[model samples]
Target: KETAAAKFERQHMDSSTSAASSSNYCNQMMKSRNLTKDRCKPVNTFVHESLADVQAVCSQKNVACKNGQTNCYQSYSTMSITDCRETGSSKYPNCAYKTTQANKHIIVACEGNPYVPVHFDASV
Candidate 1:
């Protein structure tokens, strides 16, 4: 089992690699990140920012999460990212995605003693 923090890292963090400019970036990422294990995740985002930069958002500004939790924090600056969305016609195990390159502030839910990101909320 993966810890929430570790899982968040797996699903969201990709600072070492520049955004995959290829058309199949999402198709590859979803499978590699295990989001397509049994069912497609439908939508997901990957931040191309340093972990330290993302982690520091924990102390940036606390705000309401999509679920109404108040542990979520929005980044103070825009960061590079790619939003992967499954195509409507795509089928399971053969997932296809559209990659949208963007720069935006990220919102993430933070938790635990060390105060690391546990979930990705949104990009603004």
Candidate 2:
């Protein structure tokens, strides 16, 4: 099924929003995207680029994943992204988040044939 890749898109992809809402980017996005259901997602990054642009990283230069594998790839071009870290007082079913936006080279872990992003590793 498309669960993994689909979920990746749900959690990380957000090409439609050219800019962050500043204060409530995460609170609104996380809830509307369904990430606030079971519990607060500790941290997440949302990219302001197309899905194809992200998938292309899988075929670019390879890099070591945090866990030591080499399935990760770093993007050649800088991308606009927002880091959403859960707020300290946030609780499950009502996740609150702190949003920080930036431009950086994205790092992602890919999987399967026609390799697609399965995880967001980091940015540099």
Candidate 3:
């Protein structure tokens, strides 16, 4: 079974490509990261910060998740991230995405005994 921490890394962390550019970044990454297999995730984010920094978000300010869950936390500082949004013309097997990089505070839902991020809530 995949742990929440491990899932977070697989889905969100991208430390090696800190300087990622090009419009195809998301289209490539979303597939390479295995997020495009079942269905397009619609909107997803890949953090360009170190895993440690991203994990530390669990200790950041508390916030309400999109589902009204209070397990969400917002990072105190703006971090580098790439937002992947499914294109209007995107279809099933060919998941087209629009990639945009920005510095923003991320919100994520934390859980478990060690209190690690499990779900990506939003970015602001």
Candidate 4:
């Protein structure tokens, strides 16, 4: 089985990549990355930075999670990212998405020893 760290990297990290420019970026990426299995992921953000830099956010400022968790942290630097949001009528097999690219500081929830991100809370 893949470790939590490995799974997080597979589902969230996209270092050294820049595939968000196209209008269908989300549509292509969601299916390609296996996030569309069983059901479409409602919303997600892909970071386009070095894996080390992304992982370093754990040492940044603390923040409140959307669900009121205390483990969230905000990135110290603005990051290149693509936000993928499922369209309103997006049904199971026809998982349509809206792709938006931006440079923003992100907030994420972290856990475990040597803390690492486990949930993408938001971007600002």
Per lDDT, the best of the predicted structures is 3
**Model 1 agreement with the true structure over 1-124: per-residue lDDT tens digits:** 9999999999998887767668878888888999998898999999888999989999987889999999999998898999999887889877888888899999999999899999999999
Which residue pairs collide in model 1, if any? none
Highest TM-score against the true fold, candidate: 1
Each prediction's whole-model lDDT (CA): 0.90, 0.88, 0.90, 0.86
For candidate 3, the lDDT comes to 0.90
Backbone atom clashes (below 3 Å) for every candidate: 0, 0, 0, 0
For candidate 2, write residues 1-124 as lDDT tens digits: 4567888899999999876867889888888888888788889899998888988988887999989988999999998899999988888866889999999999999997768999999999
**What range of 10 consecutive residues in model 2 has the weakest lDDT sum?**
1-10
For candidate 4, report its TM-score: 0.90
Model 1 spans > 4 angstroms off: none
Distance (Å) between predicted and true CA of 17, model 4? 1.6
TM-score of 2: 0.93
The residue-by-residue lDDT of candidate 4 on 11-38, one tens digit each, is: 7788857547688988988898888998
1-124: candidate 3 lDDT, tens digit per residue: 7888898889998998774578889998999989999998888899999888988999989989999999999999999999999988899898899998999999999999888899888999
Native-vs-model 4 lDDT? 0.86
Error of 1 at 26 (Å): 0.9
Positional deviation of residue 51's Cα in model 2 after best superposition, in angstroms: 1.0
